Design a protein around this nucleic acid. Structure first.
Length: 231
RNA sequence: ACCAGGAUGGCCGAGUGGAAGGCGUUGGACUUAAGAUCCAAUGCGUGGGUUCGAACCCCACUCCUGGUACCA
């Protein structure tokens, strides 16, 4: 089986080459994504191009081998071909992203081509602003009803239950304003990149729970809502 | 002649079943002007077959390339 052994040895050497080439492709990818200057970006892109072309030649060889009937268990060849194609797709994505011109036809409508962290930050800020709007609407409603009940008490000169409800509304407005001011602090910190999005999402559910129902008697107010974060 | 691989923009040339890149060409900017530089636009060798659809997988044809043609 000298011919079979020769083919096997060539296969093993080619697979080792593919492994090393994928390692180098990843290294060049990280270099490119760490680049700070356009020249660095272009040079790393060219190195990635050269490495992926080498990988493409190795993959042509792998496809020719797996086409052959000499090999019987070619699972390793299949896996290496899959890996090479994954690297090729990654490089194609990288090159299409970089080559695109800002004001060319394709570039005109790139839509939200912002870092996913930036998109999530914008979403969290928008949700905080909407919550602030809802809290302000609730505060306005509560203050209007407080004025109405004060007028009613003045006209009637009684209805102690109305005085109790007015004090309850006063406390509710106090808590709504506290929530609004804490939201404003959180958003201001987020804008300056001083707070994490995960930190905001850890209290998102509790803030939703409060806004959903806060004046009802069966209100389980968790005082430890803003206590986890030293705001 | 036998075996193997190729043929895709104008030149190189990637591509795998749901026309890229470099160079080049053209329009504008920069400069007195050119060059460099900047912002942009255009650009499957052949037939058949499977497939819902093949640049891609199979059959066949043309052009090229690589290796072999030994003992008397």
């Amino acid at each position: 089986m000298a011919d079979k052994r020769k083919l096997q040895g060539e296969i093993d050497r080619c697979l080792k080459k593919v492994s090393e080439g994928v390692e180098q492709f990843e290294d060049i990818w990280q270099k490119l994504h760490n680049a700070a200057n356009a020249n660095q970006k272009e040079k790393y892109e060219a190195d990635l191009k050269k490495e992926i072309k080498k990988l493409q030649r190795l993959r042509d060889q792998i496809k020719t081998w797996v086409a052959s009937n000499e090999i019987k268990d070619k699972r390793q060849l299949i896996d290496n071909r899959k890996l090479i194609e994954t690297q090729m797709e990654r490089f194609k994505v990288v090159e299409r992203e970089t080559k695109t011109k800002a004001y060319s036809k394709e570039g005109l409508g790139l839509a939200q081509k912002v870092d996913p962290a930036q998109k999530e930050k914008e979403e969290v800020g928008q949700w905080l602003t909407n919550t602030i709007d809802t809290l302000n609407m609730q505060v306005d409603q509560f203050e209007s009803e407080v004025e109405s009940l004060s007028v009613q008490t003045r006209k009637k000169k009684g209805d102690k239950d109305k005085q109790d409800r007015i004090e309850g509304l006063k406390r509710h407005i106090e808590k709504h304003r506290y929530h609004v001011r804490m939201l404003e602090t959180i958003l201001r910190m987020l804008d300056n990149d001083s707070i994490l999005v995960d930190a905001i999402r850890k209290i998102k559910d509790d803030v939703e729970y409060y806004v959903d129902s806060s004046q009802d008697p069966d209100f389980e107010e968790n005082e430890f809502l803003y206590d986890d974060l030293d705001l």
